[PDB]
Structure 1
Amino acid sequence: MFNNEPLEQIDKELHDILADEEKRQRETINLIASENLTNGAVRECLGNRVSNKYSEGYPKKRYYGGNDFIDKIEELCQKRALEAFNVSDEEWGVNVQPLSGSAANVQALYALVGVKGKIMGMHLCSGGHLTHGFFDEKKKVSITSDMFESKLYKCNSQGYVDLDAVREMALSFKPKVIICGYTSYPRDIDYQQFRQICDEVNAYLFADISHISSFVACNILNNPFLHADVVTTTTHKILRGPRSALIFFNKKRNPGIEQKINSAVFPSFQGGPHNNKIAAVACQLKEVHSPAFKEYTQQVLLNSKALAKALISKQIDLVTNGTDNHLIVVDLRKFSITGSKLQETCNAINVSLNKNTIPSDVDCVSPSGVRIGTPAMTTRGAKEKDMEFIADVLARAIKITVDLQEQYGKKLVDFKKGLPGNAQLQQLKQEVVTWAGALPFP
């Protein structure tokens, strides 16, 4: 007693918009540092009937039976995760049920410290995530600031993590956890010195490597597994997985953390897992381990270096003046434009990027930068030589953004009015669309 008609016949209204979305992605220069494009096989898993099944609990300890085939997929996923991150299944455990990065971090944080527990993280304005304890004067913005007691450690004026400030804070504040790994930080992390500070205060070391997961997996960047008690990561960014998250815990350093983490995910926070997620994750974790994916991850860093270098050749300032990873943050202060204005401009030319804060900003309203990343475009086949052209389009967009701000003024309302119909934008968009439109598309 069901309607089995295909999507186009059953819901033409929705199917048009999705064909629209597909086309916009096809014709966009996507520089969102956190975005990627999944292959057909990962999306076959997302659409699989495995999502029909309720399997609360863990493998071989299901509440319900009929979870033989589901148990194999959940076990194949955890095996593959421990493999991809080069850790012994004897030494590290992994939980594959968190629905997204934000859920994974709140869950893992809870396990370690509980309600009212003390945590430390990087400020949002310096590149930290919301789930690293972010709050404001006006309100406790993240649950992580409300259910926990959180202190935030700023980066220095050059955009680097200042460990002295971390230590001075750690000693006075005395938290149970210190978080490292960030949302928009363009350099590598010194996990060793984080571990040193954590031992001084007897705090746990939490590394959130969602943005740099692929680098860590393929030994391109520093390895937090050597020093961290907990490692969280999302699966949908540089890793090229579905939208999901993983929690890694170090049994040797902390026996009986396996149960604490596992009970936090369920039944403390979540109910039934999403088995289509878990299957999709497993499918991508196979690909991660292959030598082909390392090459891709290497290519992300090459493109990221080339992009930074080309932007500097056109007199654009980058926070920390470069990058060790897939992402860059452009400081726009010398151009007297805001990140929000540049974003609109770039949306009008089918260039995807996000506004971002820089060290000098005192508030998240009117941030002075934009953040870009290479994983999506590297997925679409762009090489180092293609980066000059991307850098070219961004500089032209910065120029137009200045021109339009000169004409209509700095108020965003007024600035946006200049945007529709602009000859140069129509010309730049068209250029963007022609080059983007022909790049390989999974």
Structure 2
Amino acid sequence: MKYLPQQDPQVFAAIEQERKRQHAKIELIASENFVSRAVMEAQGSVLTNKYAEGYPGRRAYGGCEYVDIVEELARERAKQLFGAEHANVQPHSGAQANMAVYFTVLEHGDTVLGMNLSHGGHLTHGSPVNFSGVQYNFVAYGVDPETHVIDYDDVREKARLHRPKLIVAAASAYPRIIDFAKFREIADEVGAYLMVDMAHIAGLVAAGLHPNPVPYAHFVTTTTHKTLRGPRGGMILCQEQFAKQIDKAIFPGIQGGPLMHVIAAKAVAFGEALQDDFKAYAKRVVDNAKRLASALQNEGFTLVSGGTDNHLLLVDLRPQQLTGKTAEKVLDEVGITVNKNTIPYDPESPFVTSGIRIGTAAVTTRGFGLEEMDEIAAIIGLVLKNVGSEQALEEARQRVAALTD
């Protein structure tokens, strides 16, 4: 940076701390990643100065010729990546992408069926303290108590009982492949739209390592930030038949001016995802998650679902008589970043939990491989088996430092 250090020492000092923290810690929060310098440069561009309400070639204001080129690049690259008939790259966030789909197909009070929040579903899939739960009547399907895999007969029974106008599939903490074909079959049976929120798995989908929801879903929502390793924001994919409605839901429906600089950054991230080396990266993500899962089991940990098909895993800490909250805290002490996370049928509150969620996207981006997964698992075992030994925590601290350099 050149101008920020001089203009704002306070802001600069804090950013630099954050930059150094990102390097020093082992980042295992499943939704996180590190974007490229190209992505950040696009975000740091003069495109923040441009009002561009509307869409390419159909804007509210003049002078949008060049931001139109940027947006179209984002849209066309998104369609190439995912094989969608239409893309809307304007949503400010995953929240707003979901919001716009709901605005499109639902009236206030309509019934929606989504994944149980304590089994892996997102806040925006019907939390009673979120707009989704307040605005619409959400019902929930669950995972099997033993396998922790989505019970598709439960999805079906809930759909046939509650007659949702919309079914939502996808999750913030589900470690297995979702069967979108079965979701669509159930949707078709009850005459419901199917929305897939692929936020967590979008990078895996782009790389062909998770089945693509696009052929099965009327609407696919996603974040761009994350397995897709883009800037922070949202996107909606859909068939051409809903394109006009989806675009109108975003604007003038729920947003105003789009963030053209972030849209530029999205285009850059999609470009990166289209390359062969992103596919290799994504395979290492999944390989690393599998390896880390296996290594954790070797250390004596129980995992939700008995492992992972994707980037993420959930440790069920009940055998160790630890809460997710306790685990999160102690791991923080040694420089490992996780989050407490409810496990299916969790006897503890969402503020305490019996689990920790772990993902490999971030560490894989940093160049971590299988050997690093083994060591991370060994460090976690050392810490969680010795929460009362400061000497064990210091050893863990030193082994963490050894990994980050």
Q: TM-score range by the shorter chain?
A: over 0.9
Q: Distance in 2 between matches of 1:285 and 1:262?
A: 20
Give 1:108-127 correspondences, 5 Å limit.
108-127=101-120
Instruction: Check conservation: 2:214, 2:238, Cα contact below 8 A.
Output: no
Greater alpha carbon shift after TM alignment, 283-292 vs 107-116: 107-116
CA deviation after TM superposition for structure 1 residue 117, in Å: 2.1
Match of 2:55 in 1: 58
Find the residue that maps to 1:224 and give its secondary structure: coil
Select between 195-204 and 114-123 the one with higher mean Cα deviation: 114-123
Cα deviation for residue 109 of structure 1 reads 1.4
Q: 1:184 Cα shift?
A: 0.3
Amino acid at match of 2:386: I
Unpaired runs of at least 5, structure 1? 135-139, 405-421
- TM-score, structure 2 normalization: 0.97
1:207 is paired with a residue whose SS is: strand
After TM superposition, give the deviation of residue 5 of structure 1 in Å: 7.5
Residues matched between the structures, number: 403
Q: Identify the residue that residue 28 of structure 1 maps to in structure 2.
A: 25
Match of 2:36 in 1: 39
* Equivalent pair of 1:80/1:282 in contact (CA under 8 Å): yes
Instruction: Report what 2:140 is aligned to.
Output: 152
Is the CA contact (8 Å cut-off) linking 1:41 and 1:283 kept in structure 2? yes
Letter in 2 for 1:20: Q
Q: 1:174 corresponds to which residue?
A: 163
Matched, 1:399 2:405: no
Distance 1:258 1:9 in 2: 46
Alignment check: 8 A CA contact 1:73 1:279 kept: yes
Matched residues in 1 for 2:288 and 2:162: separation?
A: 41
2:313 partner SS: strand
Report the CA distance between 1:385 and its aligned residue.
1.6
Contact kept in structure 2, 1:86 and 1:217, CA below 8 Å: no
Q: Secondary structure in 1 aligned to 2:208?
A: coil
**Larger deviation, residues 115-124 vs 313-322:** 115-124
Shift of residue 426, structure 1, vs aligned partner: 3.0
Matched, 1:101 2:94: yes
- CA deviation profile, 1:22-42 (whole Å, cap 9, x unmatched): 111111111111000011100
The Cα offsets for residues 48-77 of structure 1, whole Å up to 9 and x where unpaired, read as 001110011111111100000011111111
| Equivalent residues in 2 for 1:365-404, closer than 5 Å | 365-401=351-387, 403=388
Query: Residue 411 of structure 1 aligns with which residue?
Result: none
Once the two structures are superposed, the pairs formed by residues 66-77 of structure 1 within 5 Å of their partners are 66-77=63-74
Q: Which residue of 1 aligns with 2:245?
A: 260
User: Which of residues 198, 217, 235 is equivalent to 2:206?
Assistant: 217
- Structure 2 CA distance for aligned equivalents of residues 93 and 371 of structure 1: 33
Aligned-partner Cα distance in 2 for 1:364–1:5: 43
Q: Is the 8 A contact 1:234 1:245 kept in 2?
A: yes
Once residues 207 and 11 of structure 2 are traced to their aligned partners in structure 1, the CA distance between those partners, rounded to angstroms, is 39
Cα pair 1:133 1:142 within 8 Å, conserved: yes
Equivalent residue letter for 2:143: C
**Amino acid corresponding to residue 205 of structure 1 in structure 2:** L
Structure 2 contact 30–312 (Cα < 8 Å) conserved? yes
What SS does the aligned partner of 2:235 have?
strand
The alpha carbon displacement at 1:114 in A equals 2.7
CA distance in 2, matches of 1:433, 1:332: 25
**Of 271, 275, 289, which aligns to 2:274?**
289
1:260 Cα deviation from its structure 2 partner: 1.3
Instruction: Give secondary structure in 1 for the equivalent of 2:112.
Output: strand
Shift of 1:365: 3.1
Secondary structure of residue in 2 paired with 1:178: strand
In the TM superposition, structure 1's runs of 4+ consecutive aligned residues that sit over 6 Å from their partners are: none
Q: Deviations over 1:135-194 (max 9, x none)?
A: xxxxx2111011111111122213111111111110111111100011000000111111
AA matched with 2:116:
H
Contact 1:82 1:93 (C-alpha < 8 Å) held by counterparts: yes
Alignment of 1:259-338 (within 5 A): 259-338=244-323
SS in 1 for 2:225: coil
Aligned amino acid, residue 397 of structure 2: K
1:433 equivalent in structure 2: 401
SS in 2 for 1:205: strand
Computing the radius of gyration from Cα coordinates, the structure with the larger value is 1
Aligned-partner Cα distance in 2 for 1:27–1:433: 7
The RMSD of aligned alpha carbons is: 1.3
